[PDB]
Structure 1
Amino acid sequence: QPVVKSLLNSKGIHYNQGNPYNLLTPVIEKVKPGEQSFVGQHAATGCVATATAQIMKYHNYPNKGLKDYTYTLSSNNPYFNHPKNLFAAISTRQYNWNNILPTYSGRESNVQKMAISELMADVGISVDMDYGPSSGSAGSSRVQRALKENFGYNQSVHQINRSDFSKQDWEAQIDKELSQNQPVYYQGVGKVGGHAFVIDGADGRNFYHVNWGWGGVSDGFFRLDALNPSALGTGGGAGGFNGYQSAVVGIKPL
């Protein structure tokens, strides 16, 4: 395994799911029965959107969006009145990557905050985000489609599933991406839920650098069969995103 220092860290890229990343997600409309109110707050961007947006920032691509996207929220979503349709005019977008900064500390201009919030909202919509205080998407299968069809990334973009490869061949594909300076979209499920994140480095001893999309919290080196960030888990136990794993590789503009 080649040594590759964190690609996202090298470019200062650290996104999150709350403010100021979520200033253009849908505003929560309803209180879920038995839950405290999030009414009037913007929905989380979604880990799938945050992971994808960080990779998009790494490439500062696209210059221009290719195709709009529209979808309808599930009617069992308790945070919105139904039916609820969402729309992103991605075909009209000219993303200014000067204004979409690598990270946000709060002191940025409203133009800079709106720039990342627009990208976040576009990406979330393109992957049919189930918006809420937390926001969920199917992930990989929608991400690979969105990157090519809506945002114009190269046809090299595709999903790979962990179950389709030996451990060696799986990690070899991740290694190849990193060797070509291409961060990898990655997701998995376990006993602390499902999550999407970015693989962007390797330390030569079969650990990979992970950017979890929580603004930096828990970022570090992990084995791909022990993707277990300590930021999660109440009670003091173990848990990680080690099942139903998939990735989106070949992410590049040209």
Structure 2
Amino acid sequence: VIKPDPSKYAAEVSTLLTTTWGQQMPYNKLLPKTKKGRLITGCVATATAQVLNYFKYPVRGIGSHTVHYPANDPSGTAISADFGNTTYDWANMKDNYSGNYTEAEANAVATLMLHCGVASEMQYGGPNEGSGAYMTDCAAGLRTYFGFTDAEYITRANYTDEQWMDIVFSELTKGHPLIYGGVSPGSMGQDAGHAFVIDGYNKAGLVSVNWGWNGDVDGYYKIDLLNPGNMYSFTAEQDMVRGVYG
């Protein structure tokens, strides 16, 4: 496990995010209900949501867009987001929705989750089925609909460990949390894949992670393992969207 050189980067970066969010109520409040329960926001959305909240930015989005549930159904339901006319209510983004809250506060995050989802071409789904998108479309969406013209997608595939971590440290050092994805290899190519935020590191070279499960099993982890409570372990096909900040 490679360690942060303090003559190049900061000696450590303590957990940046203050949100401890997830994919269900009230984050999904504005998504359709179904007979298999209400649609969930998606890991990509929840992770993007959290980072955008960190910067409380942009004030307002750019344009509009719609996706449909079920995904490629010729007559599915419209799930639309008008970024252009939405002034995001950052003030009412509670750090933790596990308690009670005003509706104002519910709608605050419910919209961000919606929009982030829509902006990534989310294929929405139920609690059992899940909602997924592609990190690549997430980048594209951030640029187009959120105004992050520097947002950029990259895979760990194309970088040696030293180079990858250089970016990880330098970005965290600059105070920029990272949207980050990886997949946990299945027993017969039945892979499981997830998106989350990396919001720090320590002298030891471990990383602070916010998985977006209402802050469950959140904490400092090894970037090569990423193994929350030994249920899963996200090693393969790691990737990120950098260039997200004010």
TM value normalised by structure 2: 0.87
Provide the C-alpha distance between the structure 1 equivalents of 2:193 and 2:169, rounded to a whole number of angstroms.
23
Unaligned ranges ≥5, structure 1 = 31-37, 234-238
Unaligned ranges ≥5, structure 2 = 5-10
How far off is 1:101 after superposition? 2.0
- Give the equivalent residue in structure 2 for 1:33: none
- Give the equivalent residue in structure 1 for 2:99: 106
- Give the equivalent residue in structure 2 for 1:243: 236
1:19 to 14, 17, 25: 25
1:226 aligns with 2:225: yes
Map of 1:77-88 to 2, 5 A cutoff?
A: 82-88=75-81
2:177 to 161, 179, 183: 183
How far off is 1:74 after superposition? 5.0
1:63 to 46, 53, 59: 59
Provide the C-alpha distance between the structure 1 equivalents of 2:72 and 2:58, rounded to a whole number of angstroms.
34
1:4 to 3, 7, 13: 13
**Could you say what secondary structure the match of 1:98 adopts?**
helix
- Give the equivalent residue in structure 1 for 2:145: 150
1:133 aligns with 2:133: no
Provide the C-alpha distance between the structure 2 equivalents of 1:148 and 1:101, rounded to a whole number of angstroms.
26
Map of 1:153-172 to 2, 5 A cutoff?
A: 153=148, 155-172=149-166
Q: Which amino acid aligns with 2:67?
A: Y
TM value normalised by structure 1: 0.85
Give me the identity figure in percent: 33
- Give the equivalent residue in structure 2 for 1:236: none
**Could you say what secondary structure the match of 1:4 adopts?**
coil
Aligned residues: 230
Residues 116, 67 of structure 1: alpha-carbon distance in 2 compared, 3 angstrom cutoff = same
How far off is 1:205 after superposition? 1.8
Provide the C-alpha distance between the structure 2 equivalents of 1:159 and 1:27, rounded to a whole number of angstroms.
32
Provide the C-alpha distance between the structure 1 equivalents of 2:55 and 2:214, rounded to a whole number of angstroms.
19
How far off is 1:73 after superposition? 4.1
Residues 139 and 196 in structure 1, CA contact (< 8 A), matched pair in contact too: no
**Could you say what secondary structure the match of 1:247 adopts?**
strand
Measured on the aligned residues, the alpha-carbon RMSD in Å equals 1.8
Provide the C-alpha distance between the structure 2 equivalents of 1:82 and 1:218, rounded to a whole number of angstroms.
39
**Could you say what secondary structure the match of 2:84 adopts?**
helix
Residues 209, 75 of structure 1: alpha-carbon distance in 2 compared, 3 angstrom cutoff = closer
